[PDB]
Amino acid sequence: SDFTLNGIKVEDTFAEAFDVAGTAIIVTNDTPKWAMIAATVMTGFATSVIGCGAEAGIDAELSPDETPDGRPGVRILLFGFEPNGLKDQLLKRVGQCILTCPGTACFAGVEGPTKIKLGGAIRYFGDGFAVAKRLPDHEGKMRRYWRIPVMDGEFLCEDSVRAVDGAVGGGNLLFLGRKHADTLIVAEIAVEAAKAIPGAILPFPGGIVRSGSKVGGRTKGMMASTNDAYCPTLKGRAGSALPPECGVVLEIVIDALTSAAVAESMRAALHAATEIGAQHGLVAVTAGNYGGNLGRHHYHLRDLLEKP
Amino acid sequence: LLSLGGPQNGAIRHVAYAADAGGLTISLGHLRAFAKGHLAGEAAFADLAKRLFAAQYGVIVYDPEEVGELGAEMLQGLIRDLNESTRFFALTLADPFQGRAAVQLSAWTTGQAPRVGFGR
Amino acid sequence: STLRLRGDLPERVDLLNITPLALSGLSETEAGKLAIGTSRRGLTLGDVFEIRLDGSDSLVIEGGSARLDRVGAALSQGSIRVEGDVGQRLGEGMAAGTLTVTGSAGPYAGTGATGGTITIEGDAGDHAGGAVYAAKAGLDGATLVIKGAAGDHLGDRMRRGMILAGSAGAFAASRMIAGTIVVSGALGDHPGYGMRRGTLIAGSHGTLLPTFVETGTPDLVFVRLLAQSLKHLGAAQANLLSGTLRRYSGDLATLGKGELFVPAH
Numbered sequence: 068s069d070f071t072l073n074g075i076k077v078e079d080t081f082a083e084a085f086d087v088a089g090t091a092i093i094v095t096n097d098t099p100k101w102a103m104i105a106a107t108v109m110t111g112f113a114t115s116v117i118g119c120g121a122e123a124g125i126d127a128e129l130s131p132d133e134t135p136d137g138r139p140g141v142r143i144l145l146f147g148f149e150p151n152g153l154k155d156q157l158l159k160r161v162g163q164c165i166l167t168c169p170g171t172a173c174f175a176g177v178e179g180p181t182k183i184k185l186g187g188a189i190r191y192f193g194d195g196f197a198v199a200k201r202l203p204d205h206e207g208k209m210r211r212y213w214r215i216p217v218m219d220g221e222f223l224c225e226d227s228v229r230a231v232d233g234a235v236g237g238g239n240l241l242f243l244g245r246k247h248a249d250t251l252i253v254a255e256i257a258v259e260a261a262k263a264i265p266g267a268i269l270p271f272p273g274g275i276v277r278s279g280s281k282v283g284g285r286t287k288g289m290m291a292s293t294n295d296a297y298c299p300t301l302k303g304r305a306g307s308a309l310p311p312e313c314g315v316v317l318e319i320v321i322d323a324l325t326s327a328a329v330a331e332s333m334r335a336a337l338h339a340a341t342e343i344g345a346q347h348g349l350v351a352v353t354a355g356n357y358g359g360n361l362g363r364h365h366y367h368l369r370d371l372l373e374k375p
Numbered sequence: 376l377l378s379l380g381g382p383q384n385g386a387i388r389h390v391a392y393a394a395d396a397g398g399l400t401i402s403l404g405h406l407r408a409f410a411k412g413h414l415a416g417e418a419a420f421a422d423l424a425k426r427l428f429a430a431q432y433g434v435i436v437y438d439p440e441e442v443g444e445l446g447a448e449m450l451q452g453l454i455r456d457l458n459e460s461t462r463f464f465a466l467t468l469a470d471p472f473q474g475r476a477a478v479q480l481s482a483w484t485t486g487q488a489p490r491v492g493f494g495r
Numbered sequence: 496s497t498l499r500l501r502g503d504l505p506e507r508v509d510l511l512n513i514t515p516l517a518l519s520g521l522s523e524t525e526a527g528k529l530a531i532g533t534s535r536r537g538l539t540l541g542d543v544f545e546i547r548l549d550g551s552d553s554l555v556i557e558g559g560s561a562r563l564d565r566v567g568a569a570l571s572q573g574s575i576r577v578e579g580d581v582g583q584r585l586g587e588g589m590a591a592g593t594l595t596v597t598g599s600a601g602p603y604a605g606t607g608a609t610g611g612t613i614t615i616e617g618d619a620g621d622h623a624g625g626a627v628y629a630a631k632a633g634l635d636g637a638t639l640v641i642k643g644a645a646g647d648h649l650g651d652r653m654r655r656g657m658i659l660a661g662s663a664g665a666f667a668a669s670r671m672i673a674g675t676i677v678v679s680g681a682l683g684d685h686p687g688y689g690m691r692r693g694t695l696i697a698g699s700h701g702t703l704l705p706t707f708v709e710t711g712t713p714d715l716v717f718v719r720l721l722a723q724s725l726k727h728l729g730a731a732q733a734n735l736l737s738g739t740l741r742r743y744s745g746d747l748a749t750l751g752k753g754e755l756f757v758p759a760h
């Protein structure tokens with residue numbers, strides 16, 4: 068039953084992930100500095116879909132070659148429960164975090180089956196002065212963009228953005244370690260490994276979560292409560308799932324446009340953490356599950372053994 | 376019949392449980408922890424806790440003199456935890472020097488327990 | 496206002512409502528007739544002390560006996576200084592102010608104190624900071640400083656406030672509802688019996704209860720705040736929090752939300 072990876076104990080559990088609506092947008096600016104500013108203000112306040120509006124993250128920085136604009140850009144993902152709630156959140160965030168940022172321009176990030184109106188709705192801030200243009204892109208496909216007049220110039224925004232089907236969120240694996248300062252470093256180099264997978268992001272601050280989201284609760288209609296089992300202050304008593312050597316636990320949550328990306332992002336995090344884990348006191352690695360019946364996708368750590 | 380702190384070998388057949396080093400008061404607190412589910416299993420008092428909760432009419436007999444004020448409040452708390460599952464009670468032992476009647480009488484004459492002064 | 500103790504007390508004496516606010520209102524000759532004796536024969540303030548009165552919020556009792564019950568009780572203003580030893584219930588139900596005692600103190604000192612600071616430069620008696628008979632709580636918010644060593648049941652059924660002791664006896668922090676007790680030195684056997692919530696910090700400690708489990712050596716933000724709080728008040732126990740501490744969880748007989756900190760090694 069016990070599993071050992073790179074000399075560090077790994078529990079024989081699975082990560083319970085859920086099906087989610089996901090979409091991607093490419094935001095470009097004249098400089099990469101302001102491309103990042105625009106994305107950073109858009110991704111903020113988006114660590115969970117249940118409390119925050121959505122789950123947002125920056126997938127990758129784009130060079131002037133990887134972009135339809137020809138200007139340095141940013142590929143930024145957004146996830147939500149329902150395709151309507153996702154549309155509602157994208158409209159709010161693009162409208163007041165992208166449109167407001169100077170010199171920006173919004174394009175559709177990923178290809179998908181369902182359509183989401185973006186430029187066609189922000190066009191109404193133009194007060195009837197906005198115009199629409201249709202142009203074939205570098206691949207040969209006819210795309211429609213809106214031109215909203217603003218103080219700095221024109222905010223060009225593609226009419227529609229596509230939402231990919233089968234985007235998976237909630238894939239997580241948590242680390243148990245002796246000391247906060249050192250074990251944070253283990254998780255830090257763990258998120259750096261996971262970020263690299265295309266189409267996958269980590270919404271929480273720096274990718275790391277310190278509050279253990281537990282389903283249910285002790286009193287009345289608790290929807291979420293802290294995970295008393297993995298709390299170091301509640302050690303020694305029955306119901307604490309961590310050994311006496313452990314003193315700090317940190318969780319890593321991954322969302323991705325494709326299910327395979329969730330598994331590959333977890334695998335890379337699982338390996339990178341254990342390789343350096345012994346040096347910084349990493350005791351063990353487990354995954355968060357809810358019982359098996361809540362979430363469709365199960366990411367067993369036993370399948371993540373193969374090196375990347 | 377279970378016994379905490381009683382003699383190990385008696386004429387009457389009973390299941391005796393060894394008292395802790397600190398004393399009966401320390402054992403009483405130790406026992407309540409297993410009944411609350413706060414301490415790991417496979418201990419001596421863990422079996423005792425399992426046997427108590429599996430009850431129909433439970434009585435814990437004790438002498439408040441030898442157990443002490445703190446132990447009795449703990450003992451009375453252990454009963455409150457036990458009553459979440461089955462009916463449990465305490466058989467508080469009486470003193471042999473009419474002290475319990477003095478409490479009864481003083482309560483309805485003065486409005487308070489004994490050890491009362493009328494200087495004012 | 497100075498009360499010069501004439502001599503030794505023949506019976507127990509109750510100094511309740513003998514607060515400089517109350518003495519200032521009453522006339523100097525009228526205040527002498529105030530009876531404070533427990534017995535039927537009783538004793539008036541003039542029989543016990545040499546009353547020198549002035550319209551001030553400062554009171555100083557020159558000379559003290561262990562038969563001075565309820566000294567500083569229900570004090571809501573100003574200060575009372577006892578140059579000597581005192582009896583039970585130092586500042587029972589003290590609302591606010593400052594109450595300093597040169598000598599030692601009697602049992603149940605500090606009960607029900609809401610605000611202010613009670614300082615005992617000597618040693619505290621049994622049940623110091625603890626609840627009296629049938630009392631809902633012991634210390635209920637006023638901070639109690641004992642430069643000497645407290646007896647058994649320090650902070651018994653304490654609800655609020657802070658206790659700063661030099662040394663402590665057995666069953667310290669028993670039945671504690673909430674609060675913080677920092678004894679710089681020794682701590683008696685079986686500390687925190689029945690503890691529900693609260694923070695107990697000691698340099699030395701006796702035998703611990705089986706219902707106390709060790710959490711480890713965690714660097715907590717609260718510890719940093721409690722240290723700075725002790726530094727600002729000039730506490731000798733401030734140095735005890737400088738190093739890394741060992742933690743124990745509150746007694747599992749009640750809800751285990753209390754804690755105990757002892758230096759690592």
Ligand SMILES: [K+]
Nearest residue numbers: 126127262263
């Ligand atoms: K990335």
